[model samples]
Target: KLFERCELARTLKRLGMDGYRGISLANWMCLAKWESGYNTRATNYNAGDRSTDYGIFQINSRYWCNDGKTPGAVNACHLSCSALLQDNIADAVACAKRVVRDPQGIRAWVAWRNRCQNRDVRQYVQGCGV
Candidate 1:
């Protein structure tokens, strides 16, 4: 599913991520925009290193998920990387929550580090009221 920014905000809230447990809703929305533009099926492969990122959260196959073709995958989420590409993002949300509990927390998202970090992202949600 492709989500508009407001829809993404609303959906994220519906998934129990409205800044729950310290994962900022603004930051997650901003990160998702930069990572996948709300496209649930988004996928990126870094051919130079044979690493892959999948779905709206751009979960990496290297440590968080397994693409099966990728060697040495840790599969921390214990699911196929493609599972995150589903139209419904339940699996993606579950895995992302797992990622947020890690030592780096949401810093696991490089896009968040480069773009949303330390910025006032209240505008990212704005009148969406999430």
Candidate 2:
């Protein structure tokens, strides 16, 4: 866990960020959970189709992978941990950072992350902390 977290932090820094620098750690964790259930090896199947959005960040293949080596796009989706573990964390963190920054702070920023650190039910509900 420490190594993975370190990788995430490092990746964020490499992207010219000192940290979430834009969002909260709690928020980051929340998005990860919602995306991939914190499973780096998890995949989602809708209907009869299959897709793998591995890692705690749950990046979609269509967005990150090469659809035939096109220019100006990344082809890291099919990369393995040994290949990506070297870089995936940063890529994932960078992607999440952009999403959180999209609306200059999207609503539900706190609730989605469930920031209590103790899984307190209140964090998931309105009028609990606000």
Cα-based TM-score, every candidate: 0.95, 0.43
* lDDT of model 2, residue 26: 42
lDDT tens digits, residues 23-128, model 2?
5454454455465555455544333333334455655444454333233444443443222223346555555555446454434234354543345432322232
Tens digits of lDDT, candidate 1, 1-130: 8988888898889999877568789988988889998899999998977889999999988888988777776899988888999998889999999998888988989899998998888889999977
Report lDDT (CA) for all predictions: 0.88, 0.44
Q: How far is candidate 1 from the true structure (C-alpha RMSD, Å)?
A: 1.1
- Model 2: residues with Cα > 4 Å off, grouped in runs: 1-21, 48-52, 64-88, 104-130
- Regions of model 1 farther than 4 Å from truth: none
lDDT of 1: 0.88
In terms of lDDT, the poorest run of 10 residues in model 1 is 16-25
